[PDB]
Structures are given as structure tokens and as C-alpha cells.
Amino acid sequence: TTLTPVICESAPAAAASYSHAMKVNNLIFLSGQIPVTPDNKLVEGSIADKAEQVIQNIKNVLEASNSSLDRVVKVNIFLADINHFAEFNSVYAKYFNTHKPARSCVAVAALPLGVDMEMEAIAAE
Amino acid sequence: TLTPVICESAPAAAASYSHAMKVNNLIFLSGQIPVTPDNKLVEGSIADKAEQVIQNIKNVLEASNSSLDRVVKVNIFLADINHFAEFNSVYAKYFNTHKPARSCVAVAALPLGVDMEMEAIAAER
Amino acid sequence: TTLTPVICESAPAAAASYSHAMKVNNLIFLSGQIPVTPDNKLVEGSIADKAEQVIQNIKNVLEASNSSLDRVVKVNIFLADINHFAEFNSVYAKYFNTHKPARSCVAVAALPLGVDMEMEAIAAER
């Protein structure tokens, strides 16, 4: 069993002591991503703009991990407000169309930096 | 290779996701809520709702060539922490001799305003 | 595929029908740990004191599962109050310095026994 951390510059710097992803053999566990740009600026706009940045962050981490969106196995979504469900789902369906990972989604009390959502994922190398 | 699982006996997915996704020997199941396979919200007690949730999970496991006794980890999201004990007493009917690792938290809200969401990870037969 | 439940005597007794950990071949899934002593008493004190007990519980479960902190793959943190983020992170950083697992952290509405945090993890066996 080999453990290989992943840290990529095209994703926001970790807000605490964690790698962007950790590979255990061929399985990749990705850290939760929030709507922050690679240069660490909070995303402004709509829920669509925010979700778009979150998935781009995930996409970039997957690339640095020798994986891709098409190789995502499971995704967990945490929303700051359950009413943002449909708007998030729309951007989500844009990236997961032909390939549909398993998924869970819940509305939590609050997220780091007061953001609207956090998304984590597990993918195959 | 990643193998998607579509379960005809489970409620239709609320977003762009498969009921489960298999990667090698592991199965990642999507979050299930107290909704009948005819896609109607379960009305009644926490025990009644818990029963439907686990039944949906059981059905998905069967469709993924797995079973309750092969579940490795379960994550429970409650809409109200006070439902903990009652939920636990129904949960014990399905996981008694076989006890998966588990986590349980109470979140702010869940899709469709339901009282709980359960996801899991299992080993293929 | 071999599934091996792990019973950790030095961790708080399971609050429901679950194992402290479950090993599936070389991967280990750990149950959510809360700030309770091995003697089932709820830790009283600072966020740091609670964070220390949760990480020690996780440490003991890792040991019982033939693993270690430096073999942790992913950690998920659930806080009862997002404002405890910084204090929790400070303690967390002590145990995950050279080795930094993937991680997620969210604040939820409430946790079992009314505690302030719950930590689960996935680790690799030695």
C-alpha cells in the first residue's frame, strides 16, 4: 500500500494542514474545495459562478492526481443553504453528464470563510 | 474500470448521479432518503422513515452485487439530532451481527425537506 | 475481500451499532470519534482539550487497526460551531505536520451527546 500526497498550484492554498488529495494505491481522496480562486480570492457572483470555480478547482486537482472528471467515483456536496440545490445541480450536470459518479448532498450550518458550498470527491487514477 | 449501478427498485436520482459506483472491489452508494421507489415521500414516524431509507440502501446493494453484511462504512445525516436514539433502534435491526464503521451528524436541512439521508460504502461479493 | 471489524478497548464504547473501525483488505474506515474519554466521560474545557481527546481516540483506533497517524489517507471534520475552526486546526496541525491527509471540514447543526466536534478518517494498514 503506497500513499502519495498531491498538491497543485492551480487550486487554492490549503486553509489548514492538508494536501489537496491523497492517493492510496490507485484510489484518490480529494480534499473539500470551496468557491475560492487559485490565487485565494473569494468568488463573488451567482451560485453558478461559485460552483463553476469549485469544480474547476476539483478538475485541476484531479489532473495533478493523474485522474479526470470521468474517473470520479463518489462526490459529496455540502451546501450552506438547501435552496441553492437546483442552481448547484445545473453546473454539476454540465461536468457530470455521460459519467455520473455516486453522490450525496446535504445543507450544513456553515462552511469555512462563510462560503456557499464545499465539494469533496474520490476518484480512480 | 468504474462500473455505474442503476437500481430500478430505488427512488430516481434527484440530480446527475448513479445509485452507486463500483471501483475495483469497492462500492460507493449515493445518499438515500425516506422516499418510496414510486418517488413519494414517506409519512409517519422516524422509525418508518428509517425503514424506507435502509430498504433503499439494501436494494441498491443487491443491484451492486453486494449485501448489508458486506457494508464497510455508513454515514448518517439527521435533520434533527433528537431522532438519534429512535433511528439507531431501527438501524440495529439491519446491522447487529455485522457492524460497519459509522458516523452520524445532524445537519441543517436535507433535499426535499426529509428527516434523514444515509450513504454507504460496501465490498462487492 | 476480507472485512475485519476492529474493537478498540481504549476508545469510548460505540454509541450505536457500529465498530470502532472496519478493515476492507488494506483500507481502514474509522468511525466518527467525539471528545469523550475512554471512560465515557465528556471532556470539559477548551476546544483544544476536546480536539486533543478526539485525536487521541483516533490514534488509539488507528493503533488497534494496525495503522498509524502517518498512514491516514483522508479525514473528515464535523464542527458543531464553525467558529471553533482555528482552535481545532491548531491542535490538528500538531499530529498532521510532515504527513498531511486529504481533508474536509464543515459545521453542522448538532452532534451526538451534544459534543462540539466529530472526526472520522480512512487509513492504510501497515
Nearest to A31 among C26, C96, C104 (CB): C104
- Rounded distance, CA A52 to CA A44, Å? 12
Identify each DSSP E strand in chain A by its residue range.
3-6, 21-24, 27-33, 72-79, 102-107, 117-124
Largest CA distance in chain A: 43
Chain C residues with CB within 8 Å of chain B CB: 1, 3, 5, 14, 16-22, 24-25, 29-32, 76, 78, 108-112, 114, 118, 120
- Rounded distance, CA B20 to CA B2, Å? 10
- Rounded distance, CA A26 to CA A42, Å? 32
Give the amino acid at A38.
P
CATH of domain B1-125: 3.30.1330.40
Q: Which residues pair with C81 in a beta bridge?
A: none
Closest residue on chain C to B81 (Cα): C110
**Around Cβ C9, how many Cβ atoms within 10 Å?**
9
Q: Which residues pair with A107 in a beta bridge?
A: A79, B109
Contact C82 A31 (CB under 8 A): no
Q: Which residues in chain B are closer than 8 Å to C19, comparing Cβ atoms?
A: 99-101
Comparing CA positions, the residue from A42, A31, A45, A41 lying closest to residue A78 is: A31
- Rounded distance, CA B22 to CA C15, Å? 30
| Cell numbers at B107, concatenated | 445537519
Check: CB of residue B117 under 8 Å from CB of residue B109: no
**Around Cβ A125, how many Cβ atoms within 10 Å?**
14
Give the amino acid at B2.
L
- Rounded distance, CA C39 to CA C63, Å? 18
Stated in angstroms to one decimal place, the resolution of this structure is: 1.7
Only one residue has cell 459506483, namely: B21
| Cell numbers at B44, concatenated | 409517519
The H-or-E segment that residue B2 falls in is strand B2-5
Give the amino acid at C60.
N
Reading phi first (left if > 0) and then psi (alpha if -120 to 50, else beta), residue B37 is in alpha
Comparing CA positions, the residue from B39, B110, B53, B112 lying closest to residue B87 is: B53
CA dihedral sign of residues C96, C99, C101, C103: positive
- Rounded distance, CA C103 to CA C83, Å? 18
Closest approach of B60 to chain C, Cα-based (Å):
19
Q: Which residues contact A97 (CB under 8 A, 6 or more apart)?
A: B16
Give the rounded distance of the alpha carbon of A79 from its chain centre: 12
**Roughly how many angstroms between the first and final C-alpha of chain A, as a whole number?**
14
Contact B105 C111 (CB under 8 A): yes
| Cell numbers at B103, concatenated | 458516523
- Rounded distance, CA B39 to CA A108, Å? 24
DSSP 3-state of A106: strand
The superfamily CATH assigns to domain C1-126 is RutC-like (3.30.1330.40)
Comparing CA positions, the residue from C108, C88, C96, C90 lying closest to residue C47 is: C88
Looking at chain A, list the stretches that DSSP marks H as alpha helix, in order from N- to C-terminal side. 47-64, 85-95
Q: Which residues contact C111 (CB under 8 A, 6 or more apart)?
A: B81, B105, B106, C34, C78, C80, C117, C118
**Roughly how many angstroms between the first and final C-alpha of chain C, as a whole number?**
17
Contact C78 B124 (CB under 8 A): no
Residue ranges per domain, chain A? 1-125
Nearest to C85 among A29, A112, A120 (CB): A112
The coordinates were experimentally obtained by X-ray
Per 3-state DSSP, what percentage of chain B is helix, strand, and coil (rounded to 5)?
A: 30, 30, 40
- Rounded distance, CA B2 to CA B5, Å? 10
User: For the sheet containing A3-6, what is the strand order?
Assistant: A3-6, A21-24, A27-33, A117-124, A72-79, A102-107
Cα-Cα-Cα-Cα dihedral of B5, B59, B35, B115, to 10°?
A: -100
- Rounded distance, CA A84 to CA A39, Å? 25
Closest approach of C72 to chain A, Cα-based (Å):
9
Only one residue has cell 480562486, namely: A37
